[PDB]
Each structure stands twice: as structure tokens, then as C-alpha cells.
């Protein structure tokens, strides 16, 4: 047994050493195991919401003001607005003026510390987060397409027919490329959509936004990457099949926010104008008129 301890003392101390080394990994995992939640449970009882609550838009903006975290300055100041169920309001403004944080506040993503911005009777803070972000629809500026196939990237739940996917892609105008694509359907999109061009990725994620029938459909800068010709084609095919649906557009180009129902300009966290775009063009001293003037 003296031969045994001479054999095994190095094994004892070395196995203790890399046991501590691998214990550091469990320490890091346990350090990330104690992160905060997001309170996915809503205040309202789930039977008390309708099956079809968003049948009207009827969005009031009742003294909303948002921050990102509690140590920060508020992103949006006191804003006051009201949205018709069928209308086609577009939003524009200078960069960094909270116009995407507006959309995050619509999804309870950015931190809401003020506001009674109830949409068609039900409150935003009271709603369950999964029911909220399941039955609304935001399209982003960055195409963030996952790996896998066409139908998987378009509908990962397999909750629709392929004719609906063909229709939502027809109103996305990709049928000429995906029909010439050798898969047709279920062709492989790589890990990040690098198989296609950048605006094609944007059109793919726009088509994925199109398959969700939600009646409330806010757009961020979703035409910021595509060309103006297919932007005009997509703009004249939207608000035709999407006539009843309320759109909230962050237009990267003013010449589609011109044809609108209302417009809000946003600078420094507050509403500057909230009216028809046509009379804002005929104010002759407005930020919208200088926006379209510096545009073209």
C-alpha cells in the first residue's frame, strides 16, 4: 500500500486540480442560471380576452413614455395619439428619434413606465406576452432569417397550406426566383440567408410577416434595403390585399409615406405633428415638407 500511495498521490492532486477547473464551468453556468425572467404571465385572465380582440385596431396612445432600462433617460416623452381601425398611418423622423422604440413599446419590449395605450379594450401591461406577440406582427430592418428550408423559414409551425404561402410570397414578389429555384419549395436557405441577396432576404422576412393574419401590422424600415421599383410594386400590392388591415409604417423613403392616411413625425421623443400628410405638405413650414424637399 506504500507502493499504492506512491502510485496514486499524483492522481489525487491532479484530479483535484482539474476537478476544480471543470467546477469553474458549473460556476459559470450557475451564474447564468440565476438570470431574470420577463413575466410572461399576464395580469388578465385568458378567458376574459376575446378570440378576436384585434378585429378593430382602435389604438389610443394615452400619455405613453418609454425607457430601455430604469437607469436610463426616457426614450419617448409624453405622446398622445389615436389610431383608426382601417387606416394606414405612416411614421417618419430623424435617426435615433425613437421610432423603432415606438414599435418595441407596441410589443412591450422596451420598458414601459407610463402609458394607457390599450388596444381595442384590452390593456398592454395586463395582456399575456405570448398572446400579445403571437397575434401582432412587426417586420424589422435587419433580415434575420434562420437556417433550414423555405416552408420552415416561412412557417416553422406548419400551420397553413402551401397555397397561402404562395399567396403571401406573391404579394412579396419572389415567385419568379423561387419558382426558378430547383427546390421550388423546401429549398435550403443557409444559416443566415446568405444564399440570397440582401433585399431578397428582406423580402423573405416580409413574406413571413405576410403569412400571419393579425389585423394589426406595424412596419419598421422594411423597404430600406429593396430598390425603389420593387418598392413601388410592393407598395401598390400592399394596401390592396391589406386594405382592411391597419399598417403602421416606418418608411425609409418619404415617397411612400406621402400616400398615407395620417403621419406622425417624431423628434426628441415627442410627437411634432399628427394629421393628414397632404395638409402637412401644404403647411409650407413643416418638418415633413422639408423632409420631402431634401428627398427630392
Amino acid at each position: 500500500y506504500a507502493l499504492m500511495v506512491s502510485n496514486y498521490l499524483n492522481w489525487m492532486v491532479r484530479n483535484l486540480a482539474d476537478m476544480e477547473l471543470q467546477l469553474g464551468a458549473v460556476k459559470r453556468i450557475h451564474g447564468l442560471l440565476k438570470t431574470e425572467a420577463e413575466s410572461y404571465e399576464g395580469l388578465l385572465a385568458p378567458s376574459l380576452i376575446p378570440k378576436n380582440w384585434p378585429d378593430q385596431g382602435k389604438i389610443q396612445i394615452q400619455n405613453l413614455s418609454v425607457r430601455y432600462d430604469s437607469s436610463l433617460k426616457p426614450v419617448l416623452k409624453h405622446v398622445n395619439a389615436l389610431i383608426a381601425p382601417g387606416q394606414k398611418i405612416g411614421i417618419c423622423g430623424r435617426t435615433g428619434s425613437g421610432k423603432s422604440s415606438f414599435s418595441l413599446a407596441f410589443f412591450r419590449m422596451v420598458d414601459t413606465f407610463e402609458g394607457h395605450i390599450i388596444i381595442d379594450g384590452i390593456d398592454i401591461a395586463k395582456l399575456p406576452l405570448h398572446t400579445l406577440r403571437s397575434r401582432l406582427s412587426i417586420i424589422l430592418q435587419d433580415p434575420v432569417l434562420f437556417s433550414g428550408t423555405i416552408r420552415f423559414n416561412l412557417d416553422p409551425e406548419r400551420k397553413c397550406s402551401d397555397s397561402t404561402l404562395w399567396e403571401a410570397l406573391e404579394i412579396a414578389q419572389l415567385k419568379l426566383v423561387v419558382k426558378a429555384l430547383p427546390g421550388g419549395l423546401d429549398a435550403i436557405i443557409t444559416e443566415g440567408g446568405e444564399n440570397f441577396s440582401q433585399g431578397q432576404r428582406q423580402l423573405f422576412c416580409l413574406a413571413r410577416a405576410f403569412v400571419r393574419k393579425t389585423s394589426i401590422f406595424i412596419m419598421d424600415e422594411a423597404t430600406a434595403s429593396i430598390d425603389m421599383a420593387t418598392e413601388n410594386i410592393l407598395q401598390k400590392v400592399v394596401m390592396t390585399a391589406f386594405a382592411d388591415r391597419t399598417v403602421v409604417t416606418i418608411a425609409h423613403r418619404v415617397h411612400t409615406i406621402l400616400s398615407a392616411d395620417l403621419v406622425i413625425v417624431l423628434k426628441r421623443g415627442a410627437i411634432l405633428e399628427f394629421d393628414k400628410p397632404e395638409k402637412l405638405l401644404s403647411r409650407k413650414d413643416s418638418v415633413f415638407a422639408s423632409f420631402v424637399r431634401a428627398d427630392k
Binding site: 430592418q141 435587419d142 441577396s197 440582401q198 431578397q200 434595403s225 430598390d227 418598392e231
Partner: protein, 244 residues
Amino acid sequence: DNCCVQIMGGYFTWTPDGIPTLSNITIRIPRGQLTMIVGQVGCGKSSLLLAALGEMQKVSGAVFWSSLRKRGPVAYASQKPWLLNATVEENIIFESPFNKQRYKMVIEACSLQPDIDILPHGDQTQIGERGINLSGGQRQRISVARALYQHANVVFLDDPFSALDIHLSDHLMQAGILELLRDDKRTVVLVTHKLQYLPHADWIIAMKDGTIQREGTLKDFQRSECQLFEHWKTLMNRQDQELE
């Protein structure tokens, strides 16, 4: 002759077991002038620059590079921006000799001075993956600022006006390119969808489905392919004004 790249008869593919993504290319890009390469979405615009950079393979054709042969140091900023986990200064300098004057000239070209002011340690903050996440227009302006600082004499640019407003695009249009870029006589190629700047173009090449259409000047496009000229007039909506 100032022929920058005289690729003639080119035929470029992504898949070697596939169709050529670009068809016959015979572009004649001049040196020291701004040129806008314009097509629709997915018609070979970035694929042409990746072809001229040699990153895509060709089944035929012959690229004719020219120096002041082989391709020299050409600066480039892609559609998707790419960042280094370093300081913003090291991101823009990109292993160049430091010049405080020209780093200033590109920081007021790209107009990232309030953004470096809001940055919590200024010029020496770690950005990228191991670092603070940025908005995206910020990353775009960083990627074009490192293209500005490079002293390439031939610079390539993909669209910087994806994640910018009207003000930042015009400030990047008037200052920066054609102001910092042509007094130093730096050859610049720029693909864009914002057609309001092709007025400021010494050359334009059109493109459709991997095929280039006719190239030339804006008075040449007043003659050639008048369907495309009226399409660009109607799309820019300054249809009363004649584009030159």
C-alpha cells in the same frame, strides 16, 4: 486610358455546378470618377463587385485590372457590415498609419461625432461581439468610414444608405464622397437604390437578372434605353426636371 477594370466577356457563377449568376460582362470602369451600378434587387449588383474582387469564380472571361497586372489594395464595405472587436478608432484606421487630421476628416465625413460623444468612453470603447452593441446605421457608417480612411485610390462601396436617414445620406453624399474622394482622385464604385444621386454620376451601368444592360453616361441614357430613363424619371418623381 484610365481603364480601372476592363473585364470583357465575363461569365461568373456562384455554384460551379450551376448556371452563371452573371452573364456577359463588358464594363469599362474609368479611374478617378464616381460610377453608380444600378439594378433591381437580386440582379447581380453585389455579385459583380465580388466578381471583380475575384471572390466569385468564373467559367470564362478575362478581367483586366490596372495599377499605377494584379489587383491592388481596394477598400470595400459590404451590404452587411463587418466589425472588429476593438476600439472604434482601430476599427476605422484598420492597421493604417494614424493621422489625426484625416481621422477627423472622415469622422466629419461620416458624421459619427455625436455618436462618439454618446459613446461612454469615446474613441476607446470595445464594440462588436465582445463589446457594446450598436444601432446598425452606426455600424454602416463605421464600415464606410474605414473605407474612407484607407488610401486605396480605388474604393468599392456597397449601399451605405440602407440604415440612414435623408440627412445622413446627403451629408455622406455632399461631404465625404465627391468632396474628400475626388480632390484626392479616388476611384469609387457605388451600388444604391436611392436614385436621387445618379445625377451625381460620371458613369452609370444598368443591370437586370445578372445581365448588364448598356453602360455609359446620363446623357447616353437620355439616348439609350429611354424606357429605363423614363422609369428613373417617374421613380424619382422629379418628372418635370430633366436628369443630367
